[PDB]
Amino acid sequence: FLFFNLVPDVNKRFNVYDDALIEIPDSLDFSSERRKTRFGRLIDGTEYGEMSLDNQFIGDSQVFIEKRSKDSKFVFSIVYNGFTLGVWVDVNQGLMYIDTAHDPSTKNVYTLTTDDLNENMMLITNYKNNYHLRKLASAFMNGYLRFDNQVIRNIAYELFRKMR
Amino acid sequence: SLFYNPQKMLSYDRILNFVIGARGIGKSYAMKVYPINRFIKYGEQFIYVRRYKPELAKVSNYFNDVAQEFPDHELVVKGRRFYIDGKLAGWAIPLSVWQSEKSNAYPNVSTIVFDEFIREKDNSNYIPNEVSALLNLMDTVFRNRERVRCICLSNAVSVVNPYFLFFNLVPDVNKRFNVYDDALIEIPDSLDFSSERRKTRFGRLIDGTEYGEMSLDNQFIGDSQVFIEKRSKDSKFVFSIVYNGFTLGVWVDVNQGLMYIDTAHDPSTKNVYTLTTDDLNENMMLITNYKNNYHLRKLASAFMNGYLRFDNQVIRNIAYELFRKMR
RNA sequence: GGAAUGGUACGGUACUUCCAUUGUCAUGUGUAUGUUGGGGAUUAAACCCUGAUUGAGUUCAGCCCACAUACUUUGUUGAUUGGUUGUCAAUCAUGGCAAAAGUGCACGCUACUUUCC
């Protein structure tokens, strides 16, 4: 699956595509078929009570944080590793988002590293530009920063780790 | 008295026994005798798990030390398989391939006849989540609620392995037995400890003073992992440091000023601190390198001083690891 | 291979018991004095510091603890008006009750060992 990169669901018993099909078999009866065996052995009842047996029916992975967007004014713009991230603001609750937005007006476009150099952007000073974006910094420290993706989540978070 | 004595173990009759201690001191003697005792009663064959494969090429002399127990009947090995008067005795395989075994019929089991289940300071041997591996082993040696009785047997007593605190297996040094639904924690008699350790003192005096060190003491008495002074008290909840997914908090009691790291909850909705971005969401606040030393100034100082106190061993371990992370 | 006539695990009983145990419900922040009552705090001691004592070292005394009252915030997050108290929760510990704990199992073979049949 790591190769083919499949995206099934627990709901769909059959998961059909152009080529592939993931089938989850007899899910209820399976569970029921296991239930009865703990009736044949109560110590297997204690074994089922172990969280290991019940936690392989539970999946774990990284998860998103916020899926947010505005409908009002916005100011800044940043780019990193050949990928652009806009900055959105709102007076109502003064909230702050980071969503895909390109401004052909194109003021104050920034990168952390000169691998994305262009006559327009300026190599940002390490932390003085952070104080320039004091509202963005505080929004990161507080909850005033929200996004609309988990991919934007990870890119922004690695940038934050490099930010300090 | 003289030797390892499984009478109380067999007596209190958990369907799954759990004993520890006596490194090479008969912790395997009586429990390798017992399957052949079931065979003399003409019961059922036993199952022998091994940690790895090379450990198998030399171990065909498994019945040498039980002849002096039962000289009477024939106790031999044909090769891989064990034979008592020619009847099959033990299903003997290491771990690697039990899955290929698990579709076979296993109608006859008597007892768990393995020891050194877990070795101190040995996890390269280990297999991830092998606790559930033993679950698969037991369910592939189960047919009903009978014919089976299990033992664990580690060389020494520890309180850090996942199995214990997963089952809250707590040792007691004052009393021999610790009882639960099915789990016992025990050790041979403290009087038998005196007798046998005195027996070792007799004879090889160097082999006695080597037991005088805690090195050989801890193998059989198991006084381990209780390192920091630890207490508890009734202070007010003040601060909480969400680290790698933990609701750790701090009680600060000014009268006889000490910081107690017990776990509790109040609806503070503030002062909760995260040292990682993974534990940060939109209702707690992030703290960089130094600002812990200042906002948790009490924490920093009480750690530098002896004023910081602890409550639980797991909390102690995770907190010391955090103290290593904080730089 | 037969015991349950050895100690025995447990259940679900009884005889003594202790909300340690999960729940069910009432309690909570600060000085001021009192011998509050008791525990002198009692290495004696030598000296001194302080605070009443009376002509005056003459007397005694300085430590903690629960209570009686006024000075006050059950702590704590929120709903409240323009803003302040008061009404609905939290966890914290206390206390009372069950449910729970020790003593025989004299209620049983669900049961290992156990020495003999």
Ligand SMILES: Nc1ncnc2c1ncn2[C@@H]1O[C@H](COP(=O)(O)OP(=O)(O)OP(O)(O)=S)[C@@H](O)[C@H]1O
């Ligand atoms: N009933 C017994 N009769 C005689 N010796 C005994 C008895 N019970 C234990 N022993 C002793 O136990 C020793 C062998 O026990 P082991 O089977 O090695 O126990 P162990 O603790 O598993 O050690 P390893 O690592 O398994 S070899 C003998 O040499 C005796 O000293």
Ligand SMILES: [Mg+2]
């Ligand atoms: Mg052994």
